[PDB]
Amino acid sequence: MIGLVGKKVGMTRIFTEDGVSIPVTVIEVEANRVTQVKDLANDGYRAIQVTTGAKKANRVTKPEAGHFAKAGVEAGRGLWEFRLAEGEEFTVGQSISVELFADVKKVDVTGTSKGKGFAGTVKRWNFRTQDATHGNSLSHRVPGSIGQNQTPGKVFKGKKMAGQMGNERVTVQSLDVVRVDAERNLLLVKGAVPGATGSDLIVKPAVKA
Amino acid sequence: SNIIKQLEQEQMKQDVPSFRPGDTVEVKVWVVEGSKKRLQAFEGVVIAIRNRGLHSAFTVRKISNGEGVERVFQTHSPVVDSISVKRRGAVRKAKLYYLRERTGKAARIKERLN
Amino acid sequence: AVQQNKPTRSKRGMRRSHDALTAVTSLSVDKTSGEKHLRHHITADGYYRGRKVIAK
Amino acid sequence: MIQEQTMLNVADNSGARRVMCIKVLGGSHRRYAGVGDIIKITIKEAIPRGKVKKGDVLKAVVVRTKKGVRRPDGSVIRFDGNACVLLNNNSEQPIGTRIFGPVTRELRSEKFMKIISLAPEV
Amino acid sequence: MRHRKSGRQLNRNSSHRQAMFRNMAGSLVRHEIIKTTLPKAKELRRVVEPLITLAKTDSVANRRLAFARTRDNEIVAKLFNELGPRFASRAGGYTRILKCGFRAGDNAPMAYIELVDRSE
RNA sequence: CGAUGUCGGCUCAUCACAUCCUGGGGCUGAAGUAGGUCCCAAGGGUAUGGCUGUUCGCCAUUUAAAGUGGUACGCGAGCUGGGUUUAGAACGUCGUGAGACAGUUCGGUCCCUAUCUGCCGUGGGCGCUGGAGAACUGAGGGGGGCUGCUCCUAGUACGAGAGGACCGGAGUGGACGCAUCACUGGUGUUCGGGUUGUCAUGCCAAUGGCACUGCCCGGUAGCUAAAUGCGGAAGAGAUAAGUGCUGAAAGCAUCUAAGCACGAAACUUGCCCCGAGAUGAGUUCUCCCUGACCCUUUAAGGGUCCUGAAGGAACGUUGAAGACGACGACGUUGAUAGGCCGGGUGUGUAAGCGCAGCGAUGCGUUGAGCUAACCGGUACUAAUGAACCGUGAGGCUUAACCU
RNA sequence: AAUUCCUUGUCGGGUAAGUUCCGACCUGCACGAAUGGCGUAAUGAUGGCCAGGCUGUCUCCACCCGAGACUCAGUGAAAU
RNA sequence: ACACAGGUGGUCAGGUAGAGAAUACCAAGGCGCUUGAGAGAACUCGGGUGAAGGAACUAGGCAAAAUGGUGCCGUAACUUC
RNA sequence: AGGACCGAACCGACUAAUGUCGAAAAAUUAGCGGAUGACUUGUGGCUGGGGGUGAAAGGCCAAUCAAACCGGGAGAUAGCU
């Protein structure tokens, strides 16, 4: 169904009665409120647009201010858009709670990965290193040969090399939900979600089964 | 932060005796033999204590029938029942890792007695 | 390691197209004295935000 | 972690003092064995009147690791000095009568029932 | 990658920068104002400020820690008698950073760091 | 031949299909299991060692399998130099001899800062038809695609027995990939302590410097794996080999010529990501500008004065963002950073003083004293009021609705 | 065998497995007696092989401290 | 060829610890080596540490690690004793 | 007593890394071998190009060696580019 945007606040564990230690991750979902609803009559695809949190008045600009104004919504940080599914119609001003996950089993967390920075070939594509000694000169960690000889006479598009690793959108699929605390607005999901402590997180039900 | 602290507090049991590194502690834990909730005892010397609130754990070392068997315990797990103390020890070091080489006689420690 | 054919003026020129130095573009005036100084820096006479912090 | 070229201490009344794991068994290109795996070993040192001798090739089963195993609560059980129990090459059936030292809970996999019913601890 | 790893290296040995701020703190507490390089100034606040806080409670033990650092009986004498009283209520930052200009020989961003005083 | 550096290993690959496994079929000297062979199929996977310079191969033990080949028998401006083609030396052998030998034997310099093409990353400019901030559709492109074992089905079908399924379902593993520090751990020369030698602070006491952090013991945060979660699919469409149904040509027969239906990890989707420079430059929402004049070859013209907005850039504090640019937060209507307060964590009973002891030292005060990057708070200092860029209602033709 | 091509000769020991190593067989392609033969304690920055120890050599690398690499300012090459 | 990590003979030679003119730290005396300031990526160089395993690496244990001192006890085959 | 042993100065140059348009037309750092002798070194003489010297590699003779260097026969000749 529809997605739900939240914030990532550390991770701990939950001891069950049997003694199984389940590692959870605390995703605080403030209160996602619907900003705009798109239809076939104007855009060709049914989708909703949400926002969350709060932003300082002198930080949100007039373009954004006018937008939130026609929805009767308090300005929040960022905006997100979720694809609807054949029939689950909402409306502007509708306050989506965290209650929508009180029944589902598996969810999918999607968020900006912890940016490792400009990583080498070993750190990124898992290239096995060369001999640390036995005469090996000036090539303890380098990638080594990256192509064939004259016949190709180029380097194929897709060749793994040293580049920017991390700081991109990564989706971990099918994570078991553990507890859905209504009051405190916490969403305990099993395992480790992506992203640094305090980034955004698009949480939505398991697309596959 | 604040919210993560509350989820740690409501799980943390509040009845664990204070024990210092070097205390001959007897720890009783549960075990499942199919369908029998049996209580197994475990004697030993507490080597190191790692305090992290909810995630705290202490390490116990026992000289079994010929093999030095070490084991840790996630302090606040329902799998652990008692942290009954026997000998209040006293050694001038927080972590007792040197007891992994010491054997028999030279592997003992003094009592606190105060 | 080595070049093959000498690059023309075309490349030489265009290679310098991004090394164009950027001007200061702004010089805030002093609240009290009326001198000019960079943002968040002191003046020639040690005044700053209308205060003789250097006194030298 | 027990892998190729690893000295172990035989934990049973079978006749071998020290063994060496020649190849971890169970899957292709597998790095190492662990908790209750099966490893093909050779015997590097035996006792005079043993049931085996220096140079035999027979399967075994690791019961004690220096690395230790992990229970499903976050508890680790680290022994001291790796150890294994010798088996009968064709059928599991452990070759010894007594089994020195302790063993761990993961030996409850039907084809080792005999082993735990003989070990002193756990 | 230094994610959430505060503290600066400043192109010197471990030994060197420890001993280096020792000398700089001496200079600062004796002259109340120094014309130094900015990155150092940013880092100097993480040494001279704890010293003034550590001097807010006069004792014998505190003098030792104040001496264990800065190694000088005159700098410690400048503290505990001047700066102890003089602040006693500034529950926070004791020094001010003032970016000045650029050093003429190497184009290094210089800055003034001085105590929140000298209005006498 | 005014130089194209060759064997093997290492690293990294990439394609073909004559297919080694996995997938789908035919036939059988196919009962079942397990096989022989042929057809279709290149999505993915496709050992670790001992020996030799080895390729090859033998042997040991695995595995679902240890594929055959192209690519300068891939790859030295990436590595190694063992081998092989430099000088030394020796044995055998041939030569009277200098020396020779696809006869073997010890020893033996591997150079190059990257302009262009390519590639992995990340930006500056302009374009996109008035300017600006946001959020998406998706043309198109890439990643991912492997599988054992046990158990149920059932010791049923099959079979004289011994043995022993197809199909379908459940659970747990190996390899590989993605992601993350809560756990177990590694590091942690910025935290704490033990201690040898010496020097210095006038000396004792206490601390500091130096000796690879002096040597060591632990260790927060980060980072990370050996640690922990997760992923391959299911399903849908059109098909290959093949199985068909109906049915002529050809009274019959026949999968095909008309027509209809099944059919695989390949193909196209479904899963994840990049993505409107997709110059075919897309769509929606919101916001801002609705001042007068002269000159002229009167044209989407030039120029003056007055206004310069939305927003941007700039500067500053900086960030789990980072090579530099960028991107994210914040600029006192403030919690962005440093400090400070309190707590946490680490180390472990500070110093001083008292007592005991001849003395080292112990005991008490004392789980103290000190504490990095952490957590929750507080403006105490530093993020100044303004300046700078960008405008002044946005061309022409045509049509439909309003007038 | 520093010599043996055919050859990794055959046999025995070491090894889970040994084209090298060690002991022996004689079919010495083409050993052999001062262009010296066979032994040999001592010694070798000598060759080949095995064993204990210990280790990031490796399975498989992770962190960390420094000098460059990187940006700003100054001087300013070279092969081609 | 240079204000170059090179080469060049003789003499004096202090305090602590040490067997010492080794080495560690200092006195007398002389210097901080003629580019600096930041950032704290890959990768290279010189280094520190490391779970489990311990030559499985490879041409080969090359390199690293490790052993290391004084006093006493004790010490084989073989041999020109 | 010793072409004895362990080890600095001093002399030598085996391994590896760096450097290979370097700091240097063969060096640095970490280890290495000899170190009372056939040693090492200062100063000053002797030998000479088909000759010197050589614990013999065709090594060395001014970074040059299977015949040095400088000038002269000399514009050697060149079926070759």
Residues of B contacting chain D (CB within 8 angstroms): 31, 57, 64-74, 77, 79, 100
Q: Which candidate, E109, E105, E43, places its Cα nearest to that of C41?
A: E109
Within 7 Å: CB of E12 and strand F? no
Segments in E32-109 forming alpha helices (H): 38-54, 61-68, 75-78, 83-87
DSSP class of D63: E
Distance B64 CA to H16 C1' (A): 53
| Chains in touch with C (≥3 Cβ pairs < 8 A) | E
Domain positions in chain C are 1-55
Resolution reached, in Å? Answer: 3.7
Q: Chain A within 8 Å of D73 (Cβ-Cβ)?
A: yes
Number of domains composing chain B: 1
- Domain span at A139: 1-209
Chosen for mutation from E35, E100, E110, E118 (greatest number of chain C CBs closer than 10 Å) is E100
Q: Tell me the chain A residues in contact with residue E2 when contact means C-beta distances shorter than 8 Å.
A: none
3-state secondary structure of B86: strand
Experimental method: cryo-EM
Number of domains composing chain A: 1
Within 7 Å: CB of A132 and strand I? no
Read off φ and ψ for residue A13, nearest 5 degrees.
-135, 160
Q: State how far residue A113 is from chain B, nearest Cα, in angstroms.
A: 21
**Domains observed in chain D:** 1-122 (2.40.150.20)
Judged by CB atoms closer than 8 Å, whether chains meet at D74 and A19 is answered as no
DSSP class of C21: P
Read off φ and ψ for residue C51, nearest 5 degrees.
-155, 125
Q: List residues bridging with A21 in a β-sheet.
A: A15
Residue pair D50/D86 in contact (Cβ under 8 Å)? The answer is no
3-state secondary structure of D97: coil
Q: How many CB pairs under 8 A join A and E?
A: 3
Read off φ and ψ for residue A96, nearest 5 degrees.
-75, 120
Judged by CB atoms closer than 8 Å, whether chains meet at A13 and D73 is answered as no
Tokens of D55: 């140079």
Distance D54 CA to G12 C1' (A): 18
- Domain span at B25: 1-113
Q: Which candidate, A116, A101, A106, A113, places its Cα nearest to that of A5?
A: A101
